């Protein structure tokens, strides 16, 4: 058990594919251990992870987006060339200002505003499926799931038609860069794109200020800035366009990819939801608990504090294995049972808990559900192809990079 702690290394397929199994030894007998390879303390139980989430002052989110690659000087020269602000936004921002800015900026995330976005999401998903439904074999990631949540994020932000087109090239992957160990070349490539995107968003922001009463989160926040100029700076506003895209894009991509994989691998359940689409919200919620996109999430202590009887020093890094919590038999009865009727499925921790709890989780849920509904209605007869599933190595987000499915187009329901 001591060897397991000393050898712990999440940068390998076993942690990405089934992290809950990978740390089951710790969840059952070692609720906190130090991982030398990471200089992280690792917690694996639902109650422990809830305890850390619940106190945003003692357990700071400052390391949530900190890569495990050595710092790159070329990355900073590139970002400084583009005038990058290096702002911490809500997800990794400390108190007191975090909750004050959340208070001022959260209103457009309210569920009453969801119906405003649902038609655009349904239309996006329909058009995406139209592009491949007649082919008989598709990669659901590259051919639909990757792009939909990016474009939905742009709509939520209020990006105008013309700009959304020019932004397609900025829909790059950030997961390894923020949560993994990118090579020096990967660091530089991402930095350049982020600098260019910063530049572009600065021009979008100026234009949005010209039409500050129009729709979308950016315009709403511009109006809030006029009311609370000491809370919302120009640099923070500029940083939030990218922050919200990154928060909204790959998270939803991975959630939906995993959900489809789980549903198609549990064919009796795919059968049920094809016959009764009203089961889909519940089914998506248990997909998040059983095969959710969040393997782990991070905090850093700001004071000495006891966790599972160990006094952590100031500044200690903590890896919360959220996937292990979601499979914790001490909170979830029969946790390895994929049960879309599970009454407490929504107590999973993929959206966090407490001060930073995901602001867009119900938009994320809607996207998952609409994509599942479209595929179950129009391709009930598809199945997973024989394939290897590859996972990008990083501590936080897990999903197959591709998801090949196959079907007989002549049996498409819409041809009957
Ligand atoms: C299934 C999809 C998603 C997942 C799994 C997810 C996951 C998360 C997680 C783990 C956090 C941090 C939780 C914490 O520290 O307590 C978070 C926060 C956040 N999410 Fe999401 N997210 C998703 C979709 C979205 C979407 C679509 C949006 C925007 C429309 C969004 C916007 C945000 C924002 C702004 C925060 C920062 C909240 C804060 O720190 O106060 N997320 N999300």
């Amino acid at each position: 058990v001591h060897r397991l702690a000393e050898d712990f290394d999440p940068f390998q397929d076993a942690y990405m594919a089934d992290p809950a199994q990978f740390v089951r030894w710790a969840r059952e007998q070692v609720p906190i251990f130090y991982a030398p390879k990471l200089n992280y303390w690792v917690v694996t139980r639902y109650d422990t992870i809830k305890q850390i989430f619940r106190d945003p002052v003692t357990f700071s989110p400052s390391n949530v987006l900190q890569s495990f690659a050595q710092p790159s000087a070329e990355v900073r020269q590139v970002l400084e060339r583009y005038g990058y602000a290096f702002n911490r936004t809500l997800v990794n921002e400390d108190e007191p200002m975090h909750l004050e800015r959340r208070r001022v900026l959260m209103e457009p995330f309210a569920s009453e505003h969801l119906a405003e976005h649902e038609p655009m999401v349904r239309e996006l998903v329909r058009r995406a499926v139209n592009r491949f439904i007649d082919t008989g074999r598709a990669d659901l990631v590259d051919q639909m799931i990757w792009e939909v949540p990016f474009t939905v994020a742009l709509h939520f932000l209020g990006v105008d038609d013309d700009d959304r087109e020019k932004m397609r090239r900025f829909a790059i992957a950030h997961t390894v860069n923020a949560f993994g160990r990118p090579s020096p070349e990967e660091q530089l490539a991402v930095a350049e794109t982020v600098g260019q995107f910063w530049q572009f968003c600065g021009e979008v922001l100026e234009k949005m200020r010209r039409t500050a009463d129009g729709p979308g989160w950016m315009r709403y926040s511009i109006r809030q800035q006029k009311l609370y100029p000491d809370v919302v700076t120009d640099s923070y506003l500029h940083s939030m366009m990218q922050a919200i895209i990154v928060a909204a894009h790959e998270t939803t991509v991975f959630a939906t990819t995993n959900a489809l994989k789980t549903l198609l691998e549990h064919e009796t359940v795919w059968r049920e939801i094809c016959a009764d689409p009203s089961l889909i919200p519940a089914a998506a919620e248990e997909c998040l608990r059983y095969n959710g996109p969040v393997a782990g999430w991070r905090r850093r202590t700001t004071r000495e504090v006891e966790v599972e009887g160990v006094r952590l020093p100031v500044g200690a890094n903590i890896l919360m294995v959220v996937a292990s919590a979601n499979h914790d038999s001490a909170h979830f009865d029969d946790p390895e049972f994929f049960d879309i009727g599970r009454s407490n499925a929504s107590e999973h921790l993929n959206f966090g808990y407490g001060a930073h709890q995901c602001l867009g989780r119900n938009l994320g849920r809607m996207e998952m559900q609409i994509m599942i509904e479209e595929l179950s209605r129009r391709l009930p007869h598809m199945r997973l192809a024989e394939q290897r599933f590859d996972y990008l190595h990083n501590v936080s987000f897990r999903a197959p990079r591709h998801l090949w499915v196959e079907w007989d187009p002549a049996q498409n329901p819409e041809r009957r």
Side-chain angles (χ1 to χ4, degrees):
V1 99
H2 160 74
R3 213 63 234 115
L4 291 174
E6 283 285 306
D7 297 343
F8 179 79
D9 180 356
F11 297 94
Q12 60 181 303
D13 293 332
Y15 173 87
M16 307 309 311
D18 196 341
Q21 174 55 37
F22 183 73
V23 299
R24 178 153 77 87
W25 62 271
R27 172 167 77 255
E28 288 178 355
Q29 294 175 29
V30 195
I32 186 164
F33 64 92
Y34 177 69
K37 294 182 188 168
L38 298 176
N39 191 34
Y40 270 66
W41 295 83
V42 184
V43 293
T44 50
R45 293 185 176 170
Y46 185 90
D47 283 338
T48 314
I49 288 165
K50 292 276 298 319
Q51 176 173 295
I52 288 155
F53 270 116
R54 204 189 298 111
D55 185 342
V57 178
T58 298
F59 306 96
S60 160
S62 59
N63 64 342
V64 154
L65 303 179
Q66 285 179 10
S67 141
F68 289 84
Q70 295 313 133
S72 168
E74 170 71 317
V75 159
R76 182 167 299 271
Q77 183 274 343
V78 167
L79 289 175
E80 288 183 349
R81 178 193 167 201
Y82 286 99
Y84 195 67
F86 297 98
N87 256 95
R88 292 222 166 111
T89 56
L90 299 167
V91 68
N92 60 347
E93 186 175 10
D94 278 316
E95 306 312 326
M97 195 55 38
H98 159 246
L99 277 169
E100 301 294 352
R101 286 169 170 171
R102 182 172 173 119
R103 180 188 73 84
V104 166
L105 302 173
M106 57 177 229
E107 190 278 347
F109 294 94
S111 62
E112 37 266 67
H113 304 298
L114 286 170
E116 303 167 22
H117 298 300
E118 184 186 338
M120 165 277 303
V121 178
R122 295 188 181 281
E123 176 69 12
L124 279 178
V125 166
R126 183 181 67 86
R127 302 284 276 291
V129 171
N130 289 345
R131 182 106 53 183
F132 63 83
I133 196 172
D134 294 318
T135 63
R137 173 179 170 91
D139 169 17
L140 288 188
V141 180
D142 277 351
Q143 288 170 268
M144 164 177 54
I145 296 170
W146 184 267
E147 186 181 333
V148 161
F150 181 83
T151 305
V152 169
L154 302 185
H155 278 288
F156 176 78
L157 290 169
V159 177
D160 308 338
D161 282 9
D162 266 50
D163 294 325
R164 296 202 308 277
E165 202 71 26
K166 299 266 156 170
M167 282 169 78
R168 297 176 74 76
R169 70 187 186 105
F170 297 128
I172 62 165
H174 294 267
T175 294
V176 167
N177 187 59
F179 312 107
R181 203 172 38 241
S183 71
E185 296 74 34
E186 293 161 353
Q187 290 180 291
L188 214 215
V190 170
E192 180 68 35
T193 297
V194 166
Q196 295 172 13
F197 198 19
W198 179 266
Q199 195 289 314
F200 187 92
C201 288
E203 297 302 300
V204 174
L205 184 49
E206 275 186 29
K207 186 162 68 163
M208 273 162 180
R209 293 186 191 277
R210 282 190 275 282
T211 58
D213 289 321
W217 185 91
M218 289 308 308
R219 286 175 174 95
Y220 171 84
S221 304
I222 286 160
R223 298 194 296 276
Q224 293 299 85
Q225 180 182 43
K226 295 184 185 181
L227 314 178
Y228 315 98
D230 292 331
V231 183
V232 181
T233 68
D234 285 338
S235 64
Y236 195 86
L237 255 175
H238 192 153
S239 291
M240 280 300 281
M241 220 179 309
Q242 301 91 315
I244 285 168
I245 293 168
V246 172
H249 179 194
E250 287 168 88
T251 46
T252 310
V253 169
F254 301 165
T256 302
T257 301
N258 285 341
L260 265 297
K261 173 171 187 293
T262 296
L263 291 168
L264 287 170
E265 276 173 349
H266 293 77
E267 186 172 350
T268 64
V269 180
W270 181 251
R271 209 149 64 171
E272 283 179 56
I273 63 164
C274 285
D276 186 357
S278 80
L279 300 168
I280 287 170
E285 205 61 29
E286 173 73 334
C287 284
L288 288 171
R289 185 211 58 92
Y290 173 82
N291 190 28
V294 182
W297 210 246
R298 291 180 282 177
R299 291 294 187 259
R300 182 186 292 272
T301 65
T302 67
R303 65 176 180 91
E304 298 186 23
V305 65
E306 285 238 325
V307 180
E308 298 294 347
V310 174
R311 187 165 184 94
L312 297 182
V314 177
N317 288 313
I318 305 178
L319 179 61
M320 302 180 292
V321 190
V322 162
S324 179
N326 292 336
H327 283 251
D328 189 355
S329 60
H331 192 79
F332 295 107
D333 176 61
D334 200 1
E336 306 313 318
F337 175 25
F338 175 62
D339 177 9
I340 65 163
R342 184 183 293 275
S343 62
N344 69 345
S346 64
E347 293 181 0
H348 71 77
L349 291 176
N350 292 273
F351 297 128
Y353 168 73
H356 291 265
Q357 188 175 31
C358 170
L359 272 175
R361 60 192 185 271
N362 288 323
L363 184 58
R365 285 181 171 120
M366 182 173 74
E367 290 185 70
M368 294 180 72
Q369 295 165 11
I370 291 179
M371 285 191 269
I372 291 160
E373 195 280 336
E374 186 84 3
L375 294 167
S376 64
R377 169 164 42 81
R378 293 180 66 190
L379 295 170
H381 57 317
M382 71 173 169
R383 295 296 185 272
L384 288 172
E386 190 68 6
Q387 72 200 275
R388 208 220 288 200
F389 300 102
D390 300 303
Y391 296 80
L392 288 181
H393 292 184
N394 77 109
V395 300
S396 282
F397 286 136
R398 52 176 297 281
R401 301 182 69 187
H402 304 276
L403 192 68
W404 290 96
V405 300
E406 47 174 275
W407 66 98
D408 176 356
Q411 302 307 322
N412 284 4
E414 64 203 47
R415 300 201 189 172
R416 315 193 181 115

